[PDB]
Amino acid sequence: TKFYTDAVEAVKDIPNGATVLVGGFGLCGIPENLIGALLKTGVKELTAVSNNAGVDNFGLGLLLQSKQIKRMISSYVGENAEFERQYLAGELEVELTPQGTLAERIRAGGAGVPAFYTSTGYGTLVQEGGSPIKYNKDGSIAIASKPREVREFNGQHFILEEAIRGDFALVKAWKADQAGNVTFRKSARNFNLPMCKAAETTVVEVEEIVDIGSFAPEDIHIPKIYVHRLVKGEKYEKRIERLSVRKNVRERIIKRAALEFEDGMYANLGIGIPLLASNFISPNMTVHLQSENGILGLGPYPLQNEVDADLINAGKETVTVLPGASYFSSDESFAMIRGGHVNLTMLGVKGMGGAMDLVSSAKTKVVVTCVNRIITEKAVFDVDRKKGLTLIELWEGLTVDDIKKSTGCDFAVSPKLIPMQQVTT
Amino acid sequence: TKFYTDAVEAVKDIPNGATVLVGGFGLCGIPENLIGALLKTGVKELTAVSNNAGVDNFGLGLLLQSKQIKRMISSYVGENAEFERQYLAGELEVELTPQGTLAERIRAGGAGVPAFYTSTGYGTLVQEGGSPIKYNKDGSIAIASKPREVREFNGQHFILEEAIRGDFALVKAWKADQAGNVTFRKSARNFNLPMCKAAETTVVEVEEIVDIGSFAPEDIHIPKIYVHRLVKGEKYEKRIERLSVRKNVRERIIKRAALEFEDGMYANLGIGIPLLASNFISPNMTVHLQSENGILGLGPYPLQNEVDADLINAGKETVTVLPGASYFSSDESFAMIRGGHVNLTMLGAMQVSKYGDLANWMIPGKLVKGMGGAMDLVSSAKTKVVVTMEHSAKGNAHKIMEKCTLPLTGKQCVNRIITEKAVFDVDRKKGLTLIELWEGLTVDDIKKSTGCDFAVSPKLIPMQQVTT
Numbered sequence: 001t002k003f004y005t006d007a008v009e010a011v012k013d014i015p016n017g018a019t020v021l022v023g024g025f026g027l028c029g030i031p032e033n034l035i036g037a038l039l040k041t042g043v044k045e046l047t048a049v050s051n052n053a054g055v056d057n058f059g060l061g062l063l064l065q066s067k068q069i070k071r072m073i074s075s076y077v078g079e080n081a082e083f084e085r086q087y088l089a090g091e092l093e094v095e096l097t098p099q100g101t102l103a104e105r106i107r108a109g110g111a112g113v114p115a116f117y118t119s120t121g122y123g124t125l126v127q128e129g130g131s132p133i134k135y136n137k138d139g140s141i142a143i144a145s146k147p148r149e150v151r152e153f154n155g156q157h158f159i160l161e162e163a164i165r166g167d168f169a170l171v172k173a174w175k176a177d178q179a180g181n182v183t184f185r186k187s188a189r190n191f192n193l194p195m196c197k198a199a200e201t202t203v204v205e206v207e208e209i210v211d212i213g214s215f216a217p218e219d220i221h222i223p224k225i226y227v228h229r230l231v232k233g234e235k236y237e238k239r240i241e242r243l244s245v246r247k248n249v250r251e252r253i254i255k256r257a258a259l260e261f262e263d264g265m266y267a268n269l270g271i272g273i274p275l276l277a278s279n280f281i282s283p284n285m286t287v288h289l290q291s292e293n294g295i296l297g298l299g300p301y302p303l304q305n306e307v308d309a310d311l312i313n314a315g316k317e318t319v320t321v322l323p324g325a326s327y328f329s330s331d332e333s334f335a336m337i338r339g340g341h342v343n344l345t346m347l348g349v350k351g352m353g354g355a356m357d358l359v360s361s362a363k364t365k366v367v368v369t370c371v372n373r374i375i376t377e378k379a380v381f382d383v384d385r386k387k388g389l390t391l392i393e394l395w396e397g398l399t400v401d402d403i404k405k406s407t408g409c410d411f412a413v414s415p416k417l418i419p420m421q422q423v424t425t
Numbered sequence: 426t427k428f429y430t431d432a433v434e435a436v437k438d439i440p441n442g443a444t445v446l447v448g449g450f451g452l453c454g455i456p457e458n459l460i461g462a463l464l465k466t467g468v469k470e471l472t473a474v475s476n477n478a479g480v481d482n483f484g485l486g487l488l489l490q491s492k493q494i495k496r497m498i499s500s501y502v503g504e505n506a507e508f509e510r511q512y513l514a515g516e517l518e519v520e521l522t523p524q525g526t527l528a529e530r531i532r533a534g535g536a537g538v539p540a541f542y543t544s545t546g547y548g549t550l551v552q553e554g555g556s557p558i559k560y561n562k563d564g565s566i567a568i569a570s571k572p573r574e575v576r577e578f579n580g581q582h583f584i585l586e587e588a589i590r591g592d593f594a595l596v597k598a599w600k601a602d603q604a605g606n607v608t609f610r611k612s613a614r615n616f617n618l619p620m621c622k623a624a625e626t627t628v629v630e631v632e633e634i635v636d637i638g639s640f641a642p643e644d645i646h647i648p649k650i651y652v653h654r655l656v657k658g659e660k661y662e663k664r665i666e667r668l669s670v671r672k673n674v675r676e677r678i679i680k681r682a683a684l685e686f687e688d689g690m691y692a693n694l695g696i697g698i699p700l701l702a703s704n705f706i707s708p709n710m711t712v713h714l715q716s717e718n719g720i721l722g723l724g725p726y727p728l729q730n731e732v733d734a735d736l737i738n739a740g741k742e743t744v745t746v747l748p749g750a751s752y753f754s755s756d757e758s759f760a761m762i763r764g765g766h767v768n769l770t771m772l773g774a775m776q777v778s779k780y781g782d783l784a785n786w787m788i789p790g791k792l793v794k795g796m797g798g799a800m801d802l803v804s805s806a807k808t809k810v811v812v813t814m815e816h817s818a819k820g821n822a823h824k825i826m827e828k829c830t831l832p833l834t835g836k837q838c839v840n841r842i843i844t845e846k847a848v849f850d851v852d853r854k855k856g857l858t859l860i861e862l863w864e865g866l867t868v869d870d871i872k873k874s875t876g877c878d879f880a881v882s883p884k885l886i887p888m889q890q891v892t893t
């Protein structure tokens with residue numbers, strides 16, 4: 001690996017039209033200095049592979065503001081009006097690809113695998129194709145997405161995805177030793193790790209450079225072999241997108257969803273009612289919360305002094321982690337998810353993020369507040385792919401008619417129908 | 426994760442016929458106590474997915490000795506006589522699958538990926554199929570290997586491989602905290618890490634259990650979510666397979682192969698002349714040696730005191746590691762190799778075609794031990810493949826001929842041939858091309874010993890050698 005004292009010198013040779021992998025999840029683990037360097041060189045017509053597009057005034061958004069990006073390959077581009085603007089006006093190309101798929105396609109690109117199968121996106125516009133990649137100067141679709149080949153394996157359907165590689169990779173890491181090995185801090189890992197292996201030329205910026213020997217050989221997240229160019233970032237704005245500090249119809253659902261948790265259970269909860277339900281978990285009960293951006297053992301929102309920019313949940317909120325928790329990369333995170341290692345997944349044109357991956361495994365129970373159970377203010381429906389909807393719980397005071405009145409499709413009724421349950425304490 | 430004080434209680438429910446993933450590389454990182462526990466329960470008809478078969482009296486070999494194994498899925502099974510006898514007697518089934526492929530198929534099995542493509546094994550019996558997975562007691566073929574689907578991507582050919590999953594996984598690890606998170610020590614990692622994610626029930630044995638907080642959250646190799654059953658191993662025999670301690674025709678090739686090394690180069694060297702050549706590397710030159718079992722930055726053989734059972738090279742030899750070295754799992758190791766991140770791959774070989782094809786890992790009826798990681802090492806075009814071998818065969822037969830009398834390792838994957846007599850450059854479209862000749866020999870001499878024709882470089886020069 002070659003060390004650079006100047007960030008612009010490290011990215012000076014990036015050609016216009018090049019496809020560049022950019023690390024980061026939200027504003028966590030983004031290569032600030034390298035992005036700032038691209039603003040200096042002014043390289044354009046870039047195809048940026050980044051999970052998100054940062055925000056309007058920070059992260060990848062900056063390259064959108066300077067219009068140096070021709071195409072974005074991401075999983076979620078919300079919280080950025082500039083993107084929407086350029087996207088709709090038909091001046092920006094964008095491939096909305098599932099997060100887990102994005103992570104795995106990048107890993108494949110670095111592992112010598114040209115293509116693989118995944119159930120993520122099956123029976124979706126990802127698979128079916130037709131999704132608008134680009135609009136025309138008005139509102140008409142110029143470029144559409146091509147369909148994904150489908151194939152069956154052991155009785156299940158999967159779609160074929162191809163490896164993603166870049167000419168360059170702009171990666172953000174924590175430390176680098178003098179040999180070129182690097183490590184990542186907390187959840188600022190995400191896409192930086194795999195992206196570091198899938199480009200002709202990888203450029204890594206770090207907060208600190210230590211001596212060879214500072215790292216235990218077993219704990220080097222990225223071996224020097226993958227680090228082509230290394231630079232120590234000049235400045236680091238520990239920017240937070242959503243500061244979440246700690247100090248009814250909605251209440252019914254929450255108090256009911258809370259009954260879905262079980263001791264020793266591994267679950268992934270979407271921000272909103274699902275996550276809020278975790279607050280009503282018996283202290284005697286142990287539930288391990290997983291976060292698709294690379295965390296196992298999510299804790300409560302931090303106190304003002306606990307706040308850390310390198311630690312946020314999938315919803316982009318600052319969080320804490322409990323004892324016995326662990327961090328890992330985005331590709332490892334979705335292998336965990338795709339592989340059905342998560343017991344329960346409870347959830348409520350910006351992209352699908354990791355939603356499709358979360359419901360991609362048949363070994364994972366999916367509860368809505370593809371699907372296994374639906375919890376709502378009025379009732380609880382069980383779901384069988386072969387039998388269909390089936391009311392199993394009804395809110396005290398309501399009648400099957402009330403449900404029928406509000407429900408769209410018909411549904412069966414369990415001879416065990418009981419009033420909706422609620423967490424005692 | 427559930428902790429067990431008794432190993433047999435942790436594996437007591439394994440059904441006969443179950444497929445079990447068993448970690449380890451050679452005798453490095455093998456779950457001794459869990460294997461010992463299987464001997465106690467006596468479960469049989471097992472399909473064991475294990476990179477190797479240990480040795481006759483240790484590791485997986487013990488289950489072969491007790492005949493509890495019906496089928497073995499591995500990449501290399503040498504050094505186990507009981508294996509060889511049972512297989513030839515048609516009492517043991519075996520699927521020899523490339524190491525890198527085995528590692529990736531297991532990862533796929535844990536990552537929800539049913540199938541994927543790899544160039545490893547293309548233009549090989551791995552692709553062709555037909556090989557004997559099992560013999561009949563009369564010598565005929567009871568079970569043959571199926572072909573692998575082929576497909577082209579960006580102008581290259583790849584074969585389709587399917588994910589591997591097990592009912593149980595027997596994993597060996599270093600430490601576990603009270604929450605269930607585990608870490609691995611040095612190169613004892615290999616297959617243990619990925620196998621830990623590809624089974625319905627994983628059983629991990631550790632040498633020590635520490636308190637939650639002992640591990641930095643960033644450095645947990647295997648998160649508790651993958652550890653279903655955990656047990657502290659009762660005893661641990663730090664068994665070494667090949668103790669390697671530090672204190673000609675072969676010499677020519679070595680002294681010439683040493684000049685191939687370049688400063689800042691990442692290389693993988695096969696034990697033998699390729700590895701021996703690293704000894705002649707200018708102290709001013711920096712070469713990083715990669716080991717397929719999960720090491721970057723291999724050092725010299727250890728001094729008697731340095732010897733560590735958790736640290737061996739791909740050749741199963743005890744080694745040391747240099748400053749700034751790193752350890753990683755088998756699937757990561759081959760992602761590195763398959764992805765072409767290694768700059769130079771130098772190995773020995775039996776035959777090499779005028780286009781890059783190579784044969785060096787098997788002899789049809791006199792050496793059916795497996796390809797190990799040989800096919801993965803030549804799978805990338807981005808990696809320069811350099812073969813170092815003696816010019817001719819026994820009665821002076823040809824080795825750099827037109828076709829492979831022996832089973833191919835990889836189609837047009839070799840870039841340079843270094844021998845006692847000459848040095849050939851290899852282009853997939855232009856063919857062989859002598860570029861260096863040993864001082865004193867003539868182009869005729871070469872033509873005499875060489876198999877198929879070859880061009881001559883208008884820059885031909887006397888074969889180079891290292892020194893000051």
Ligand code: EMC
Nearest residue numbers: 123359370371385
């Ligand atoms: C095909 C059930 Hg989402």
Ligand code: EMC
Nearest residue numbers: 804805806837838
């Ligand atoms: C054609 C790459 Hg060996």
